């Protein structure tokens, strides 16, 4: 009746400081479908965040790809914050330059 989402945060292209890129937040295996996904930079919300269509997998569980434009720097910290009915509190996953 209720499934906790799995989250991965990663870049479209290998990161290079000062060069524009796209940051992906791939959220999968959740139910029900209602979900809130936002992307952060140093704790602050990123204004434009575009999402793929939501779909479901062979097991009836939902997935979606959120993404945004970002220019990675040496010092800036990026994250994906996911709010879902299966979780008491929103879940934040931080971007790792080698994951």
């Amino acid at each position: 009746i209720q499934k906790t989402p799995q989250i991965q945060v990663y870049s479209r292209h290998p990161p290079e400081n000062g060069k524009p890129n796209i940051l992906n937040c791939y959220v999968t295996q959740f139910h029900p479908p209602h979900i809130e996904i936002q992307m952060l930079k140093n704790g602050k919300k990123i204004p434009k965040v575009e999402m793929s269509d939501m779909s479901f997998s062979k097991d009836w569980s939902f997935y979606i790809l959120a993404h945004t434009e970002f220019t990675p720097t040496e010092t800036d910290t990026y994250a994906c914050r996911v709010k879902h009915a299966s979780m008491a509190e929103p879940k934040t996953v931080y971007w790792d330059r080698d994951m």
Binding site: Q8, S52, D53, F56
Partner: protein, 274 residues
Amino acid sequence: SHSLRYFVTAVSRPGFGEPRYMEVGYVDNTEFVRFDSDAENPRYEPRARWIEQEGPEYWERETRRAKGNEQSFRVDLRTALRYYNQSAGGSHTLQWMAGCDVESDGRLLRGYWQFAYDGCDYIALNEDLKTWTAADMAAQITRRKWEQAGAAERDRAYLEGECVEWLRRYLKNGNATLLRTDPPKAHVTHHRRPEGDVTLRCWALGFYPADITLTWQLNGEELTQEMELVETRPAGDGTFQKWASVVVPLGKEQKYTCHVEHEGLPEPLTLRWG
């Protein structure tokens, strides 16, 4: 084999609007069409360049089909409330997957017409395309209705006919992207752990299609049992990413090999921390 699949969802949200209705269509793992009841002017829309070739009649018919399914799913949701004695205050989900797998030949391999209510199996057309499997006493009511209506034969005719025919036409029109290969570009990274040993992470980037095998080896042994693997994930441009890591002693980097096997490669790759 290749597949054409339609993934349909209806979700009630009582007190914040009419139920939301969605359809998304895929050839293989590639999304080509979508309908969403929340859009301004809800209509079937292209989601790949190759489907844009279809003329206006295609879009008008697919739109009317989705709107018909939408009305029909909203009745299904109300019916499910009566069958399960649920109130009209709770949010509920109805999912449907229909489509076909065809061989390289072009003949049908498997048809699919299956429903779920609140993320649980409800009713499915059997592999024979003749009979239904109801998952509970409520779905048995629906099965009885559908057998009396001759639903199974109508649906078998779609799965064996239109579905197979349209997949073959989509594979031809979208030949360029659907049936291509792109090789994985691979590299190995290196991270000193505080325990005194290192993480070797093997990347595979920009490959199409999604099928790939990443493995680490120590002197030809497969190390399947001790390898961290992420799920293959979309880069958001039609290509896929994947990595596999291992932990190795600090001086023994050169003894481990990553192997990448993919359709796009002329030869499987062998990498090492350099």
